[PDB]
Amino acid sequence: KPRILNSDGSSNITRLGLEKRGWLDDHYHDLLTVSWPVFITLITGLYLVTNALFALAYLACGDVIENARPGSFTDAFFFSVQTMATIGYGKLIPIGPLANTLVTLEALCGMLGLAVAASLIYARFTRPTAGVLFSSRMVISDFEGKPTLMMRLANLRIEQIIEADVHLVLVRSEISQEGMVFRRFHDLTLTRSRSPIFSLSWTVMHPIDHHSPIYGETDETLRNSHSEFLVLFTGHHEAFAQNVHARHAYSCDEIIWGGHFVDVFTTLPDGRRALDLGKFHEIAQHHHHHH
């Protein structure tokens, strides 16, 4: 049993091609992902090499930086750094027609330099994360007189997410009248799918009624169709004053028949009502007798 969706809801499918690419994915399309400290290294790195190059560029021009040593790389490099940052001390003024032309070019570079560098930082850099915890398991047990598929999520930060949508989706292999076998998605209807203010915990619920794609199914039948469940969550995070997304996926064998999530809200001596996420993945079962 290989898994079509990973737990984080990434696709396992291998992709085939080697030709074109996202314009701007990389001309984030193709930096704004890797960790903060790394990001800085890269910009730092790029900052140096760029300078050390213009440095190399002045030298190959001659002894054309005043008050500089003959053909010295450090002196020049620092003049470069001193040109690009736009520090312009003066002691190291340019010389002639050429050096000066590299100057105005080098200034331009550090200017855009700064802009791009600003864009990234803001882009990140923004992309905020949702701090949403999904339960490691699902359960099917009775609620309001129906067997109900359930799972739950928690908000890991103190800030509030408002206008929160969850979508719970069955994915499985089906056969058509026409004898074609395909992979189909079903949007399980939830007792409730919109929570206007998500702040603590949320048990999402699919009553398996006669209208449910999983009516009359069992573990065995679910495994036969290699059924999986995909959960997508979204919301506007008060913290970032921005939007957030989280996904997660579950396979059949992560569905506990009969289970009940343990209550996650507590009452305490200090602070009264509380919420203990230590219990978030806890599920109760009734264990049957042996002989």
- Spatial contact of 181 and 220, defined as CB atoms under 8 Å apart: no
Least gap, CB of 103 to K ion (angstroms): 13
What string marks each residue from 221 to 240 as x (binds its own copies by CB under 8 A) or -? ---------x-x-x-x-xxx
Binding mask 55-94 for K ion (x = CB under 5 A): -------------------------------x-x-x----
| 43's tokens | 């910009």
Q: Is 194 in the site for Cl ion (CB under 5 A)?
A: no
d(CA 52, CA 106): 12
| DSSP of 42-109 | HHHHHHHHHHHHHHHHHHTT-S-BTTPPTT-HHHHHHHHHHHHS----STT-B-TTHHHHHHHHHHHH
**CB atoms near residue 59 (< 10 Å):** 19
DSSP 211: T
Cα(230)–Cα(275) distance, integer angstroms = 26
**Residue position matching structure tokens 């940052």:** 85
- Strand duo 132-134 + 138-143: pairing: unpaired
Q: Which of 111, 219, 224, 284 binds its own copies (CB under 8 A)?
A: 111
183 binds Cl ion (CB under 5 A): no
Per partner kind, with CB cut-offs from 5 to 8 A, the member of Cl ion, K ion, its own copies, none near residue 157 is its own copies
15 contributes a contact to its own copies by CB under 8 A:
yes
Task: Tell me how far apart the alpha carbons of residues 155 and 130 are, in angstroms, rounded to a whole number.
Answer: 8
**Cβ closest to its own copies, residue 218 vs residue 262:** 262
Place of tokens 């009553």: 207
Q: How far is the CB of 207 from its own copies (least distance, A)?
A: 12
**Interactions with K ion, residue window 106-135 (CB under 5 A):** none
Contact between 159 and its own copies per CB under 8 A: yes
Q: Is 42 in the site for its own copies (CB under 8 A)?
A: no
Binding mask 243-272 for its own copies (x = CB under 8 A): --x-x-----------------xx-x--xx
Residues near Cl ion (CB under 5 A) are 184-185, 192
